[PDB]
């Protein structure tokens, strides 16, 4: 996984709803470490599955992003959650 490529994917695909690690559509479901842990989403496998397939109003990216790009953005988010958002 390549977090730097991940940041690029995040800017292009995720910041519309998750700028600042927030969630503009479902406010408590943020990208902060504490929230990812709380909801069982603090792992690459968990983020990949949800980004790929979607969940409620979290859009699915299967076929819109390549599998490796989904992997990269999951690594970014975990890194960011660890360093800056929490
Ligand atoms: C709005 C149009 C969104 C875009 C663009 C992306 N996400 Fe999202 N995300 C969105 C919602 C409404 C929710 C909550 C869904 C629910 O009902 O539970 C989510 C949730 C996530 C989560 C889970 C966060 C948590 O605290 O549990 C993750 C990890 C996540 N979203 C990641 C993510 C990525 C990497 C994105 C771009 C590729 C992305 N999301 C786009 C809404 C939207």
UniProtKB/Swiss-Prot annotation:
The keyword Heme applies. It comes from the Bacteria. Its main location: other. The keyword NADP does not apply. It is found in: Cellular thylakoid lumen. GO terms for cellular component: plasma membrane-derived thylakoid lumen. Keywords: Electron transport, Heme, Iron, Metal-binding, Photosynthesis, Signal, Thylakoid, Transport. Heme c binds at residues 14, 17-18, 58. GO terms for biological process: photosynthesis. Binds 1 heme c group covalently per subunit. One of its GO terms (molecular function) is electron transfer activity. Belongs to the cytochrome c family. PetJ subfamily. Functions as an electron carrier between membrane-bound cytochrome b6-f and photosystem I in oxygenic photosynthesis. Monomer. This is Cytochrome c6. The lineage of its organism: Bacteria, Bacillati, Cyanobacteriota, Cyanophyceae, Nostocales. The chain holds residues 26 to 111 of 111 of the full protein.
């Amino acid at each position: 996984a390549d977090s730097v490529n991940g940041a690029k994917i995040f800017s292009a695909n995720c910041a519309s709803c998750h700028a600042g690690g927030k969630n503009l559509v479902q406010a408590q479901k943020t990208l902060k470490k504490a929230d990812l842990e709380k909801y069982g989403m603090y792992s690459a496998e968990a983020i990949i599955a949800q980004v790929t397939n979607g969940k409620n109003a979290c859009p699915a990216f299967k076929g819109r992003l390549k599998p490796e790009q989904i992997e990269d953005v999951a690594a970014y988010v975990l890194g960011k959650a660890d360093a800056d958002w929490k």
